Structures are given as structure tokens and as C-alpha cells.
């Protein structure tokens, strides 16, 4: 019960601060098949950098 409640807490923090790099990374992963990290590492550079401002 605590697992699913904490799951909502994680996604809400990304939606509040730095939503633009998260949405662009989500479009990259679904456009390809199941590479997951291949041909998406260039768009991964935009991610984490915005999150680095936060803890």
C-alpha cells in the first residue's frame, strides 16, 4: 500500500519542476522499438541536467 502511494510521490515531483526535458525524453523512447538507451543518449543529455539543480 505504501509502495503505490510513494510511486505517485515520485512522478509528481518531476511534473512540478523540469517537465520539458521529461516529456521530450518520453517521446524519444516510444518512437523507437525497445532500444531504451540506444539512439536516445543525445536527448538524455537534456535530462538529468535540469534535475541536478534539485537534490
Amino acid at each position: 500500500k505504501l509502495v503505490n502511494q510513494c510511486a505517485l510521490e515520485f512522478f509528481r515531483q518531476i511534473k512540478r519542476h523540469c517537465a520539458e526535458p521529461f516529456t521530450e525524453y518520453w517521446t524519444c523512447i516510444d518512437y523507437s522499438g525497445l532500444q531504451l538507451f540506444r539512439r536516445c543518449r543525445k536527448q538524455q543529455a537534456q535530462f538529468d541536467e535540469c534535475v541536478l539543480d534539485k537534490x
Binding site: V3, N4, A7, L36, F37, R38
Partner: protein, 69 residues
């Protein structure tokens, strides 16, 4: 005046000349490129598989991270 078929030889077309000769390949030099491509082949391939390991561990980490699943 009598006109008949005239004789002409000029160059004689060269009576029996060898055309077959060794070209490009020598023998020992082909093995240096042949086995040399193999050694270059494995070294280039195995470095990609080490880069695949970076993806491999990261792929299985997603299953461990996902417990609400």
C-alpha cells in the same frame, strides 16, 4: 599490268606470347592483409560488446527498480 593479292605481314602478330602473369597478390603479402583483417575484426567487435554490457546491466536494473510492477 597484272593485279593480284599482295603480301603484308608488318608486325607478324607475335607468334605465341604469354599473357598470363602474376598480378596484385604475391603470396606472403596477402596473408598479412588476410589475417590482419581478422585481428582488426575481433578487436573492433569485442569493444562494441563491452559497450553492450553498459546497456545490459542498465536494462536489468529497470526490473529491480520496478517493484510496484
Amino acid at each position: 599490268x597484272x593485279x593480284x593479292x599482295x603480301x603484308x605481314x608488318x608486325x607478324x602478330x607475335x607468334x605465341x606470347x604469354x599473357x598470363x602473369x602474376x598480378x596484385x597478390x604475391x603470396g606472403y603479402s596477402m596473408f598479412a592483409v588476410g589475417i590482419g583483417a581478422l585481428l582488426f575484426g575481433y578487436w573492433s567487435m569485442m569493444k562494441w560488446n563491452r559497450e553492450r554490457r553498459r546497456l545490459q546491466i542498465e536494462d536489468f536494473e529497470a526490473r529491480i527498480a520496478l517493484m510496484p510492477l
